[PDB]
PDB file of C-alpha atoms and ligand atoms in Angstrom:
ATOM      1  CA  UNK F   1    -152.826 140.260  21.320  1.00  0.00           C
ATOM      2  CA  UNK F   2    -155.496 138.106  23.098  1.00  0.00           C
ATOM      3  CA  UNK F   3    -155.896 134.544  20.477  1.00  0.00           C
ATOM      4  CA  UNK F   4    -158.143 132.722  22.974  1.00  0.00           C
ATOM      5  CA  UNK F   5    -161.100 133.144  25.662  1.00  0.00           C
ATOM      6  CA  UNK F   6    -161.343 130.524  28.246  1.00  0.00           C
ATOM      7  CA  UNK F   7    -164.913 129.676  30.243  1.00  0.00           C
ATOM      8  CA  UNK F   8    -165.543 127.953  33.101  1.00  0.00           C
ATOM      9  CA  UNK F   9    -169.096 126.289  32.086  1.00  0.00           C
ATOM     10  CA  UNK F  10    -170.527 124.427  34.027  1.00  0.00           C
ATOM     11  CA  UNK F  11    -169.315 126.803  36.887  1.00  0.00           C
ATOM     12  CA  UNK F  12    -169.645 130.601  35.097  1.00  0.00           C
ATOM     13  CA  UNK F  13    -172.368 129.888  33.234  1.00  0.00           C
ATOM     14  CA  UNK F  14    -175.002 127.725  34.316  1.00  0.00           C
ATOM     15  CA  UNK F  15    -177.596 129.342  36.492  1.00  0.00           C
ATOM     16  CA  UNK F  16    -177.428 129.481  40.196  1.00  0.00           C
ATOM     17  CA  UNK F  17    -181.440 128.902  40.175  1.00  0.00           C
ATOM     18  CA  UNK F  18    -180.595 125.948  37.647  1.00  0.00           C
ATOM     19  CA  UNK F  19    -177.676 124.334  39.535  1.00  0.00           C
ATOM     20  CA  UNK F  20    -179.594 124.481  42.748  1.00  0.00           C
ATOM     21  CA  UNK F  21    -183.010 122.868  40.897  1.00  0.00           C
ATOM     22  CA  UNK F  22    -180.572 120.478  39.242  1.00  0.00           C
ATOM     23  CA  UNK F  23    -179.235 119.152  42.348  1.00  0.00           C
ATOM     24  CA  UNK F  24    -182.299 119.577  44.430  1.00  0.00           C
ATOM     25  CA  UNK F  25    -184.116 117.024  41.662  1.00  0.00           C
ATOM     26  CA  UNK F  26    -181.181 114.298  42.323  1.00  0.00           C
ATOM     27  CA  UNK F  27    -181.939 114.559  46.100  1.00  0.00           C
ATOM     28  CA  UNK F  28    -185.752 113.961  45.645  1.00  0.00           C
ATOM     29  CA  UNK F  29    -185.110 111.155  43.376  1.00  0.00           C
ATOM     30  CA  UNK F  30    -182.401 109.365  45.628  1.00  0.00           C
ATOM     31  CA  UNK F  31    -185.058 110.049  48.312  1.00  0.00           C
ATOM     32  CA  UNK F  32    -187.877 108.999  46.757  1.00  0.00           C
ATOM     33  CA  UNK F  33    -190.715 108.689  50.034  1.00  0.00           C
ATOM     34  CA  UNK F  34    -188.047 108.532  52.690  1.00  0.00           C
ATOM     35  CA  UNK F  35    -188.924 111.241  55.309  1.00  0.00           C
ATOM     36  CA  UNK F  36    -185.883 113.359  55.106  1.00  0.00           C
ATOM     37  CA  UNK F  37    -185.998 117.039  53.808  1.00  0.00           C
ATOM     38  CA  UNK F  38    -184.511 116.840  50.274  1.00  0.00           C
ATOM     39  CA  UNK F  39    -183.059 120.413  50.954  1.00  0.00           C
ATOM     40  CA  UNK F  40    -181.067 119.107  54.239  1.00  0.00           C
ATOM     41  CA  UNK F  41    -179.662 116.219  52.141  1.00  0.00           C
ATOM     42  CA  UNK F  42    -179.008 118.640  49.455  1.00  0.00           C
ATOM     43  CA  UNK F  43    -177.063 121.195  52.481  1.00  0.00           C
ATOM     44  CA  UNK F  44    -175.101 118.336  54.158  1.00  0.00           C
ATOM     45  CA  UNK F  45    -174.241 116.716  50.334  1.00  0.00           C
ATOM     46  CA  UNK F  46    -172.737 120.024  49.619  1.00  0.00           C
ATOM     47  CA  UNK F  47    -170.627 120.680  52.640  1.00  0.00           C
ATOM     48  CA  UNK F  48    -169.565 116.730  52.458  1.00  0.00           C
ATOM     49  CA  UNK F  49    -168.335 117.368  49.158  1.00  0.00           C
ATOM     50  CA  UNK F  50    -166.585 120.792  49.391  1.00  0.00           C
ATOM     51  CA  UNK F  51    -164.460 119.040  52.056  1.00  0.00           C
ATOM     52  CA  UNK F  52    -164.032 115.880  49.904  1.00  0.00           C
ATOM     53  CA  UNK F  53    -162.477 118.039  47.332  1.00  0.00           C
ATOM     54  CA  UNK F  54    -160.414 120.513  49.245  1.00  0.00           C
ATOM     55  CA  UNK F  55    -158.201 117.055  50.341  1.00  0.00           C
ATOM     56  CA  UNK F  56    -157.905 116.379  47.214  1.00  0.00           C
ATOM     57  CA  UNK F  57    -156.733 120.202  45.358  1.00  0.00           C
ATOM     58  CA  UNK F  58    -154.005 120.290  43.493  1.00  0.00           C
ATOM     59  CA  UNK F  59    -153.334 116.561  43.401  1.00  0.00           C
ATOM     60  CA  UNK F  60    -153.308 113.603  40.938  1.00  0.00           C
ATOM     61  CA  UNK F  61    -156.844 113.496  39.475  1.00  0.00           C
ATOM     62  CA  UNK F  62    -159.015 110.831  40.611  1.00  0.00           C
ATOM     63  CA  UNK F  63    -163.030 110.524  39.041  1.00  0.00           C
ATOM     64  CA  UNK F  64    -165.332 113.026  40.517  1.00  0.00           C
ATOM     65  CA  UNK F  65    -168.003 110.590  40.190  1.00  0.00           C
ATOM     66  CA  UNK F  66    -165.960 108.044  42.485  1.00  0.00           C
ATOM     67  CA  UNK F  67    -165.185 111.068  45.310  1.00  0.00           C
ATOM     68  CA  UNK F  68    -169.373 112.094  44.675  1.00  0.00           C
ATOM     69  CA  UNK F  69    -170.527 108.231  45.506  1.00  0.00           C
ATOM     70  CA  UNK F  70    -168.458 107.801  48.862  1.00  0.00           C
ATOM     71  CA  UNK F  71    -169.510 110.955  49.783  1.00  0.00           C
ATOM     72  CA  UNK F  72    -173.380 109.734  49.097  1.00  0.00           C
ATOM     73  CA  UNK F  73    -172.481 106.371  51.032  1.00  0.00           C
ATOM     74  CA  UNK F  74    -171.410 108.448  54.289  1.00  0.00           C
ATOM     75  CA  UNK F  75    -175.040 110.227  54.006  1.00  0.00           C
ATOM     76  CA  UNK F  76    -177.191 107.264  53.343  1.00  0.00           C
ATOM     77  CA  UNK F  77    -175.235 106.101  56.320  1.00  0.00           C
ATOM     78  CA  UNK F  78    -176.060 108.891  58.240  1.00  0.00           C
ATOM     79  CA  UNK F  79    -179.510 109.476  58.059  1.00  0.00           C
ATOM     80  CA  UNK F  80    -180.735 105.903  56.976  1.00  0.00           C
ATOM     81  CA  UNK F  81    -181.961 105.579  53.658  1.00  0.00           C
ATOM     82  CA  UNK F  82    -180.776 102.957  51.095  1.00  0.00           C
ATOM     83  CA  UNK F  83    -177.714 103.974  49.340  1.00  0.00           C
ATOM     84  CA  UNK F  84    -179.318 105.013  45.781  1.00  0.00           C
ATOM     85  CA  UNK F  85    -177.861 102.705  42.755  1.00  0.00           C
ATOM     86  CA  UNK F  86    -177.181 104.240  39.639  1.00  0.00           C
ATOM     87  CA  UNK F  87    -176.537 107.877  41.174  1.00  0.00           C
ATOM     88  CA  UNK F  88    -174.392 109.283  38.342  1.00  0.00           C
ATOM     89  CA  UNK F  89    -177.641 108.014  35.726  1.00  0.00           C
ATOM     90  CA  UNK F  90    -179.709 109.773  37.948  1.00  0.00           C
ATOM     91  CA  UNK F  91    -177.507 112.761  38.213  1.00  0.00           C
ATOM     92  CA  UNK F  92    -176.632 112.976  34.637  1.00  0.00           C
ATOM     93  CA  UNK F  93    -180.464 112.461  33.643  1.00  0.00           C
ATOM     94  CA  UNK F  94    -181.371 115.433  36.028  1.00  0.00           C
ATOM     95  CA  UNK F  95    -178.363 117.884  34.430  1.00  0.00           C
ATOM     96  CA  UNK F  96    -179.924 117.464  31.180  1.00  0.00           C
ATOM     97  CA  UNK F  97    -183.512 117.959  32.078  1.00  0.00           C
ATOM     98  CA  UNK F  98    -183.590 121.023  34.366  1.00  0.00           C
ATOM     99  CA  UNK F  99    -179.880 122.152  33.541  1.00  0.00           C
ATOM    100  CA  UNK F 100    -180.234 125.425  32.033  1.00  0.00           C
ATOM    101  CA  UNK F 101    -177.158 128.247  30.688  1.00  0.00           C
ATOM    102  CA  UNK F 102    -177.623 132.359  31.803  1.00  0.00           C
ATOM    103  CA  UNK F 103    -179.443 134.128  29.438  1.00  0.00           C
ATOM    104  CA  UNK F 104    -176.219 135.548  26.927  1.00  0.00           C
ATOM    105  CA  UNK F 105    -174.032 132.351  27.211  1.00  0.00           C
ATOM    106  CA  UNK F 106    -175.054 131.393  23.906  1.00  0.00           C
ATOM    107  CA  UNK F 107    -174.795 134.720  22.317  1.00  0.00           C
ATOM    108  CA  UNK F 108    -171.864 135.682  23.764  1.00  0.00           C
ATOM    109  CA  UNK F 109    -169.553 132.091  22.754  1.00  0.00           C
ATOM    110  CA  UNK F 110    -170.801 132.703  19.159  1.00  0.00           C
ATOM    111  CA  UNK F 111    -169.408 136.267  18.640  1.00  0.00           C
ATOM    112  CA  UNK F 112    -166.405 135.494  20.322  1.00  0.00           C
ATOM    113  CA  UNK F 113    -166.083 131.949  17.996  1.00  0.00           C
ATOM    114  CA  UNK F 114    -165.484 133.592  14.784  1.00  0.00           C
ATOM    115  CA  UNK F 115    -162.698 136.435  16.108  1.00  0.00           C
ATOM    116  CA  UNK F 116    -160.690 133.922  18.724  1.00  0.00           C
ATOM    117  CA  UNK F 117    -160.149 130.377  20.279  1.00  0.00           C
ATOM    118  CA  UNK F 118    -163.198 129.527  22.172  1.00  0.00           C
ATOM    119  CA  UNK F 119    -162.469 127.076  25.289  1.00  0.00           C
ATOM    120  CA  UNK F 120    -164.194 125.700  27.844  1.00  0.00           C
ATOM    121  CA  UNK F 121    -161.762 124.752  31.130  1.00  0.00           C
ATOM    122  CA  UNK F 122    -163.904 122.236  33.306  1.00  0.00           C
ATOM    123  CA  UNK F 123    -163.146 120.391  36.811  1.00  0.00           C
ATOM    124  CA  UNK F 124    -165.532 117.496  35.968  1.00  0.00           C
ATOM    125  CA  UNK F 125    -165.525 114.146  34.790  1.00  0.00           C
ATOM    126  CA  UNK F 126    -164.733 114.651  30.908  1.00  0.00           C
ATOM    127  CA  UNK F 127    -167.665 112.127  29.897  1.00  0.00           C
ATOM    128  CA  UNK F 128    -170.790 113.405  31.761  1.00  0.00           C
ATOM    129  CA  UNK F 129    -169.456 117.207  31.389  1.00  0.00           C
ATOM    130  CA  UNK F 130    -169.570 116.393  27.457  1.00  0.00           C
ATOM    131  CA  UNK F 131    -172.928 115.267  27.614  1.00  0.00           C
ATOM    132  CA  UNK F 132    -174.189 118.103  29.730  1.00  0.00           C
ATOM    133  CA  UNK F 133    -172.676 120.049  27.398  1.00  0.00           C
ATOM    134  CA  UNK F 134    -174.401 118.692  24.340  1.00  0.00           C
ATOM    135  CA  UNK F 135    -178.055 118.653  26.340  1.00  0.00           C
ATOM    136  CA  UNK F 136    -177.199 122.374  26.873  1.00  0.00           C
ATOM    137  CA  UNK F 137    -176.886 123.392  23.269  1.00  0.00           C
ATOM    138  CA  UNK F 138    -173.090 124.388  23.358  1.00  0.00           C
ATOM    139  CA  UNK F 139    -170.605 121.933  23.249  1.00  0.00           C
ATOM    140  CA  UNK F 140    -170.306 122.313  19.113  1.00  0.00           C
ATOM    141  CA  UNK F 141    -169.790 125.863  19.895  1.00  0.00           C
ATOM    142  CA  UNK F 142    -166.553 125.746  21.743  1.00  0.00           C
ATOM    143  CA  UNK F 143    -163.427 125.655  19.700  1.00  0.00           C
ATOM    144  CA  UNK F 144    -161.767 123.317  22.669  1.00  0.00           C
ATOM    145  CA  UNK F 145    -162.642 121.671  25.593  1.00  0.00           C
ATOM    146  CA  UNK F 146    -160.198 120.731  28.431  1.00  0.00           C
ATOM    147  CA  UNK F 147    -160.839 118.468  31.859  1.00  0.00           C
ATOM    148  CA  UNK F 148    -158.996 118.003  34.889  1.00  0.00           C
ATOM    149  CA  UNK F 149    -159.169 114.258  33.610  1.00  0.00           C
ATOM    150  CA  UNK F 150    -157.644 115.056  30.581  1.00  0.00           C
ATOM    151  CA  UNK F 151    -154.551 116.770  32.741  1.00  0.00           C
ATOM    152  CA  UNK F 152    -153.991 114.195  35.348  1.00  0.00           C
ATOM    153  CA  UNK F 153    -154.626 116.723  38.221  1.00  0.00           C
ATOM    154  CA  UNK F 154    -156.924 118.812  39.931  1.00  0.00           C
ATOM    155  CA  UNK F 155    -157.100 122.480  40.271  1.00  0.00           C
ATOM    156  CA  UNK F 156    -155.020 124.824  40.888  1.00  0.00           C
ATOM    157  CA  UNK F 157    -152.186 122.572  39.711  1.00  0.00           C
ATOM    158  CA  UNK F 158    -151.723 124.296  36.332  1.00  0.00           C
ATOM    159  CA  UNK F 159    -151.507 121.611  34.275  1.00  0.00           C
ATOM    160  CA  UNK F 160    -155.090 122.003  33.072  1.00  0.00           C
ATOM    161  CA  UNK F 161    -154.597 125.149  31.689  1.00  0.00           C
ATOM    162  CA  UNK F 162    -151.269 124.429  30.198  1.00  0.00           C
ATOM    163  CA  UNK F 163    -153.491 121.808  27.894  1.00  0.00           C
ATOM    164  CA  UNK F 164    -155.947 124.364  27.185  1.00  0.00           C
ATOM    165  CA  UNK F 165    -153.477 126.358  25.661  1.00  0.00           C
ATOM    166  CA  UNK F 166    -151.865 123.303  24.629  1.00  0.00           C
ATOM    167  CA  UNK F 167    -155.072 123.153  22.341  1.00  0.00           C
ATOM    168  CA  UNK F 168    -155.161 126.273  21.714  1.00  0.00           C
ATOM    169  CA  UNK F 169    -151.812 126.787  20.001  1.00  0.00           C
ATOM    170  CA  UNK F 170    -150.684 130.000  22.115  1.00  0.00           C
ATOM    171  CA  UNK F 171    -148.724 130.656  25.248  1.00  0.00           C
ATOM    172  CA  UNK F 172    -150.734 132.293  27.961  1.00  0.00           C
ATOM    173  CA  UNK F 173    -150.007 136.150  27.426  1.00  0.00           C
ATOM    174  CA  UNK F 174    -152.315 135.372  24.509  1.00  0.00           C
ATOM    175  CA  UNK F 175    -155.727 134.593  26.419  1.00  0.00           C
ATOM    176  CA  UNK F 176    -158.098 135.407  29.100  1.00  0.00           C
ATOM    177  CA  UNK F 177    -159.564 133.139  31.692  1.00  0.00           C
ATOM    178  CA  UNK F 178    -163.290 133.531  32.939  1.00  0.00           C
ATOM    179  CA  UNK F 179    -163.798 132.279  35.966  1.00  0.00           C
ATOM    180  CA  UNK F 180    -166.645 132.902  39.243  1.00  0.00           C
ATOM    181  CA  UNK F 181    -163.827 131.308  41.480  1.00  0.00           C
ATOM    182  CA  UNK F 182    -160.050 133.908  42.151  1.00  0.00           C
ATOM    183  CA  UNK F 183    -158.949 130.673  44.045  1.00  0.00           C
ATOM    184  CA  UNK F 184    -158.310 127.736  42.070  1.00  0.00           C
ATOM    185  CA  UNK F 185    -157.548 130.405  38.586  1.00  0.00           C
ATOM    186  CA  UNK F 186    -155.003 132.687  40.320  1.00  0.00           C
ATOM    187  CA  UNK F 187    -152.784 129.580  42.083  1.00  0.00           C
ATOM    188  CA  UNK F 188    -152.523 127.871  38.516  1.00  0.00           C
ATOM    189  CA  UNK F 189    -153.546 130.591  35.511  1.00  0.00           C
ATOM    190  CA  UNK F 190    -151.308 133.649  36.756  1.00  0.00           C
ATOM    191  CA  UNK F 191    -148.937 131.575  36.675  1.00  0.00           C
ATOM    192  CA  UNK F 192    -148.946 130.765  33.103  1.00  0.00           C
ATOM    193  CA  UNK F 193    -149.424 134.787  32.131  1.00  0.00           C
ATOM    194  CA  UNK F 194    -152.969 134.783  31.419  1.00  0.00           C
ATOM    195  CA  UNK F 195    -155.462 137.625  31.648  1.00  0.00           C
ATOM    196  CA  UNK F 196    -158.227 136.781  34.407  1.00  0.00           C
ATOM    197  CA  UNK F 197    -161.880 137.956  33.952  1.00  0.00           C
ATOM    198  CA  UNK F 198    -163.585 137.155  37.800  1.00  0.00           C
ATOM    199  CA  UNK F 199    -167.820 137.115  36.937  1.00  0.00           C
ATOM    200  CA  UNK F 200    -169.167 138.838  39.621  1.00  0.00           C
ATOM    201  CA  UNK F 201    -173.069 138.837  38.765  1.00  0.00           C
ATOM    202  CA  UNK F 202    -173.912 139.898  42.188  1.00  0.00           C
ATOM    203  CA  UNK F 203    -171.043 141.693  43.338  1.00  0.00           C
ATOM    204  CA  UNK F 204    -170.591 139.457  46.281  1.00  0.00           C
ATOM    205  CA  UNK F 205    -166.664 138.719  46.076  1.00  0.00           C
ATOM    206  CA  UNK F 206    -165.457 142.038  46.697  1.00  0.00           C
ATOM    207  CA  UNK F 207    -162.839 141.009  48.882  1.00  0.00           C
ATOM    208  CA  UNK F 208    -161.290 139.002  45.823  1.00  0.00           C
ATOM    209  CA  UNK F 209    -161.837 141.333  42.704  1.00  0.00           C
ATOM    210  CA  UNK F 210    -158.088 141.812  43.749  1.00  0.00           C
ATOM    211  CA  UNK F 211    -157.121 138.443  42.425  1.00  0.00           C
ATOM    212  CA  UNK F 212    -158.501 139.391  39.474  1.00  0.00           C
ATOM    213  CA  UNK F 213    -157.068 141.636  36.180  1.00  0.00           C
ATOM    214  CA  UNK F 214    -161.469 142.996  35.299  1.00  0.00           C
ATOM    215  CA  UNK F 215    -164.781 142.053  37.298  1.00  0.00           C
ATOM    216  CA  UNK F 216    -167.683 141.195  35.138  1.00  0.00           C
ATOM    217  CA  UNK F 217    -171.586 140.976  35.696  1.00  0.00           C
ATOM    218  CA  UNK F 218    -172.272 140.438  32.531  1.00  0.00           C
ATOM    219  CA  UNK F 219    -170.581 137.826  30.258  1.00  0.00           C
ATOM    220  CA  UNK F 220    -171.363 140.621  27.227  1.00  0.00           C
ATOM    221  CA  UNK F 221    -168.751 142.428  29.108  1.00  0.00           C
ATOM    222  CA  UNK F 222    -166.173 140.082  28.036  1.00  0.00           C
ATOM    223  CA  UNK F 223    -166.317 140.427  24.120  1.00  0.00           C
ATOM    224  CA  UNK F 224    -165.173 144.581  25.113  1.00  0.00           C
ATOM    225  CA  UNK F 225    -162.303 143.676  27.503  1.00  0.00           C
ATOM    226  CA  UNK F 226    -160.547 141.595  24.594  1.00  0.00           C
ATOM    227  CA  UNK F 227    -161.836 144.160  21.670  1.00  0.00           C
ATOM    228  CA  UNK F 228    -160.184 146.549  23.186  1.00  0.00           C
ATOM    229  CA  UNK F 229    -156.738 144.651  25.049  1.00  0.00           C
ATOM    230  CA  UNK F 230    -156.461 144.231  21.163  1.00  0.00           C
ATOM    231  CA  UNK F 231    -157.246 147.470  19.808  1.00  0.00           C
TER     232      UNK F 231
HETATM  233 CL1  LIG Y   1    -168.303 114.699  37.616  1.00  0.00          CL
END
């Protein structure tokens, strides 16, 4: 039977309008009145730090927050302005203030709490993603929470969701794993047995529902996949 759902958070179920806003607000702040689009920072941050982190998938963990700041040195560099002290205050401050959770994450973690193991599986920092967590209303309302810093590695080495279900008490056969991302799941969770849920919202990763054991749009979706794998 399926013991445990697994979330990917802050990555499944904060807001693409929210995330964007989020970030967006930490580029006008680092900016302040210098005379550089926020929104082209923003761009250029982003691809800067998707390459960052592909070097550094599947291997020994090192703080995101480090990898985030070099990455921020190489733009101030670039186009001029003073490197910004105090960026993870700034970005942790903005998180909480504009951060803001899909409109059934809460109701669909506290249906699921009282029936199974509720965990949240998270590729961040485990000391800012805590407090984002607790501005957003839901860290009290997962049964566990697991970090890549807590495993010693990044995604997909599996070790992160061997803890989970470390916490959890139960081998993977007995959980599902929601995830918005086939990539860094599939290379570590198949592995372990576990039954993937991709969340699709806007059915734009056809070409990877493959990866994937269901395809969501709607995290409601998820409390009827496990009613029934258990009925
Ligand atoms: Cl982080």
């Amino acid at each position: 039977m399926i013991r445990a759902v697994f979330f990917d958070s802050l990555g499944t179920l904060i807001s693409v309008e929210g995330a964007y806003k989020v970030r967006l607000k930490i580029m006008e702040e680092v900016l302040g009145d210098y005379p550089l689009n926020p929104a082209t920072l923003l761009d250029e941050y982003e691809k800067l730090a998707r390459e960052a982190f592909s070097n550094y998938a599947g291997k020994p963990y090192r703080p995101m927050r480090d990898i985030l700041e070099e990455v921020m040195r190489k733009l101030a560099e670039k186009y001029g302005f003073k490197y910004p002290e105090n960026l993870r205050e700034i970005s942790l401050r903005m998180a909480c203030r504009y951060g803001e959770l899909y409109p059934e994450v809460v109701e669909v973690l506290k249906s699921l709490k009282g029936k199974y193991h509720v965990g949240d599986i998270l590729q961040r920092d485990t000391e800012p993603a805590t407090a984002f967590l607790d501005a957003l209303g839901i860290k009290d309302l997962f049964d566990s929470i697991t970090t890549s810093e807590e495993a010693g590695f990044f995604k997909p080495h599996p070790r992160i969701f061997e803890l989970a279900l470390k916490k959890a008490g139960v081998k993977g056969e007995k959980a599902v794993y929601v995830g918005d991302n086939p990539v860094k799941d599939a290379g570590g969770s198949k592995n372990l047995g576990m039954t993937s849920i991709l969340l699709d919202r806007k059915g734009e990763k056809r070409e990877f529902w493959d990866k994937a054991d269901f395809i969501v749009s709607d995290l409601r979706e998820v409390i009827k996949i496990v009613d029934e794998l258990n009925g």
